[PDB]
Amino acid sequence: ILPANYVVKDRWKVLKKIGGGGFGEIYEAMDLLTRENVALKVESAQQPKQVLKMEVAVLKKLQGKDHVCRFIGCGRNEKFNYVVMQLQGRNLADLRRSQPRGTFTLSTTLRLGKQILESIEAIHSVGFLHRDIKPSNFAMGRLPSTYRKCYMLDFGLARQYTNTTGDVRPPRNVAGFRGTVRYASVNAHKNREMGRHDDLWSLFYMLVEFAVGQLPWRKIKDKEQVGMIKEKYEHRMLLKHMPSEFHLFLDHIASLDYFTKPDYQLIMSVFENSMKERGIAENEAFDWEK
Template sequence: MTTSAAEDLLQANQVVKERWKVVRKIGGGGFGEIYEGIDQVTKESVALKLESAKQAKQVLKMEVAVLKKLQGQDHVCRFIGCGRNEKYNYVVMTLQGKNLAELRRSQSRGCFSLSTTLRLGAQILKAIESIHEVGFLHRDVKPVDQLPREQKMC
């Protein structure tokens, strides 16, 4: 889903629930839109994930349920809050760094070393295992959705 700035659900400097101030849009697709924001209470950077309230298939509610069940697990974003209004549903979570596709492209040879690939693979499998352990199945695993744990990167 590509949208122009005029069609975006949020704009820079807009504030959600009198707490989270939008910095910029950082992603989007068929599911909705993702924004970088600032928590005006804690001053930390956050990610706001939104789906249109008019969207036929509402998936964010399930994502929130899964995220809440996974709190405290390794490899999982920290849930901060969620809500909805007449225009959109949203979830707020910790803002992560670059995804694996971006990190791979930034490598001098355009790929990870074998040891890094093996460590990343083990971390991804552990994260998927955590999802299975709480009774859910992730059906859309792809590099753009994977974020390495910074302390384990070489």
């Protein structure tokens, strides 16, 4: 879409593409007013998708919370809509690729899991589901105060599950899924309305992939095939080389439906007890700091 050295609205000079192909394209850009590098996400106003407006709404509702990028600006024209946000470092999928065996140490995996769980709690606390939890949607900070912090990205698939009063809206009988196949829960595969527990299913799949390097359905492209494996796969065997406490995490989320609030502290305890058991210190160096 936007070429290099294109200047959005005479302020944001495109430098490179850093991601795209989903509901949007995101660029690293130079903010010519502040002279600071920023992230610039663009959506064609001609796409079927019309999401960036709610990305900003979610983004400003989470402003100030940890693991959330700062909103810098947004705008629209006849060709595309855009949002400008704080630039973060490399994403967790990139970092996992660049590890020699495609795996993180358990020290990194468990401490990442704690941070991602916190950000999932955060967006759930403002009444929104993420619905596209995956490694490429999390990135480490890029500043001296943020580089050991994980940042939640891409609210383009987010949906409000509460209403104005804090009550939970009824789920639809069916809901289309337009997210990423690899880390979707079986509920998502079955076009069921996603709930808070489905964001946690994605976290569970992420952490298994981090520690083990792969998921059984890694190569499989056909979505509707992928759901069939997950529906038939015995998930306890994913935990062969995970800490034993992950059985509690698996058992809990497998028990949930759309209507039941997750026991977030149970999952947090699984991570924290796993770390204490291996003597993993919170301030230990991450794998890529090595």
